Structure 1
Amino acid sequence: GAMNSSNYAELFNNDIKLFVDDTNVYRVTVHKTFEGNVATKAINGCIFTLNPKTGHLFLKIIHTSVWAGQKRLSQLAKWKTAEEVSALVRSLPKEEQPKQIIVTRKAMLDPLEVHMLDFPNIAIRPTELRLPFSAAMSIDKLSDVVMKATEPQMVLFNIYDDWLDRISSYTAFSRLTLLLRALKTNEESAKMILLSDPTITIKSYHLWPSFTDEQWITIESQMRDLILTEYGRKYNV
């Protein structure tokens, strides 16, 4: 059924599962036409498909050419997402195929269920958690590869860098969601926290900075404060 706080450790068991977030698939800028009307211009997007146990991220880049001449693009974007996730599953060896796919938005359920009819044993589930995966495009290197794409492309990342050498998957996912929640709440301040230090660096093969364990505690606490400080800001507290 639905994934929530109560069955949260299930994310880190040994049954392969993927989260699928479609927020960033169809991305537009709304603007005015010469005649004083409103139009949209699309920009490249991405499907965010993440194994929460291993940190493996299948970033399918959605190039704006896929929208050319199509109508009802918000609706199509859900079915395109479902088509591409199904293609990903079919591309994986059987022992790598997920047993469950958890969509972050319930409107993905029927499109993904329909595209996965050939996979009756793969459970398609919603979640009651508010996950901050929309902020994936705040990670500089993911945003870079998406905007530079000139054609459809899949790029593989480990969104946990090397953290699983030192922390558990549960803790890595908690660090990830905190970071992304901070970037979603106040992108500018979150990035200031991550990068203001001229002594700290991101490895060429990593997404996040190379923090010692103690520095991560400092960073994590600064992210918590940011989320609390922003809460007071927007809700007057």
Structure 2
Amino acid sequence: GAMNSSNYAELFNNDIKLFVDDTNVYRVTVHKTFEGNVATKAINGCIFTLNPKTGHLFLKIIHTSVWAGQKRLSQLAKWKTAEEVSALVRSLPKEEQPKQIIVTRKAMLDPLEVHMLDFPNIAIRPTELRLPFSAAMSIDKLSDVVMKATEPQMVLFNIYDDWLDRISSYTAFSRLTLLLRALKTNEESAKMILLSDPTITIKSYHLWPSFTDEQWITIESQMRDLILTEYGRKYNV
């Protein structure tokens, strides 16, 4: 059943699993028409499919052309997500196929279950965790590949860079969720914290800066401070 704070270690065991987040699949700008009505213009989106143990990210870029002449796009977006996740699983060798897929939003359960009928032994699960994967488009290199796409494309990343050389999956996931929660709560401030010191760079083959173990502790501390402040404001407490 549902993935929660009680069964959290299960994410880092040796059963292959993927998180699927569909919150950046269908993206629009809302604008006024010449006649003073409101219309949307779609922009490029992405499915965020992540192995939390390895850091492997299957970023399926959703080009605006997939919406052309379609109706009920927020509904179609869930089915297109389920179609592309199902295609990804069938593309993987058997020994690489997940045993579980955890969807970050419960509305993805029926679309993914129906698309995966051919895979009765792959469990489709919701989560009670409030995961910040919507903030994936605040990672400059992920935002850049989505916005530049001129056709449907899959791009493979490791969202943990080289962190697993020094830390466990559990600690890597905690760092990722903290960085994404910060970027989601106050993007400007979070991005200031990550680049303020010009001497720490992002390798060409990485997403995040090359922090030493000591600099990560300072960074992680600055992110937690950012999140609590914002929280006091949101609620006046």
- TM-score calculated relative to the size of structure 1: 1.00
Equivalent-residue separation in structure 2 for 1:196 and 1:23 (angstroms): 29
- Residue 214 of structure 1 and its aligned partner are, at CA, apart by 0.1
1:171 paired with 2:171, answer yes
Residue 133 of structure 1: CA displacement?
0.1
Give, in angstroms, the shift of residue 73 of structure 1: 0.1
User: Cα deviation per residue 1:98-157 (whole Å; 9 max; x = unaligned)?
Assistant: 000000000000000000000000000000000000000000000000000000000000
Q: Counterparts of 2:198 and 2:141 in 1: how far apart (Å)?
A: 19
1:137-152 correspondence runs (5 A):
137-152=137-152
Secondary structure of 2:57's aligned partner: strand
Task: Give the superposition deviation at 1:35.
Answer: 0.5
Question: Partners in 1 of 2:122 and 2:232 — Cα distance?
Answer: 42
Q: Give the SS at the match of 1:6.
A: helix
Unmatched segments (≥5 aa) in structure 1: none
Alignment-derived partner of residue 183 in structure 2: 183
Displacement of 1:95 in angstroms is 0.2
1:198, distance to aligned residue in structure 2 (A): 1.3
Runs (4+) off by over 6 Å: none
Any idea what SS the aligned residue of 1:221 has? Answer: helix
Question: Is 1:57 matched with 2:23?
Answer: no
| Cα-Cα RMSD | 0.3
Aligned residues: 237
Q: Identity over aligned residues, as a percent?
A: 100
CA shift digits 1:163-195 (9 cap, x unpaired): 000000000000000000000000000000001
The structural deviation recorded for 1:86 is: 0.1
Scaled by the length of structure 2, the TM-score of the pair is: 1.00
C-alpha deviation, 1:236, in angstroms: 1.2
- The runs of 5 or more residues in structure 2 that have no matched partner are none
Tell me how far apart the structure 2 counterparts of residues 230 and 166 of structure 1 sit (CA, whole Å): 31
Question: Shift of residue 233 of structure 1?
Answer: 1.4
Q: How far apart are 1:235 and its partner, in Å? A: 1.1
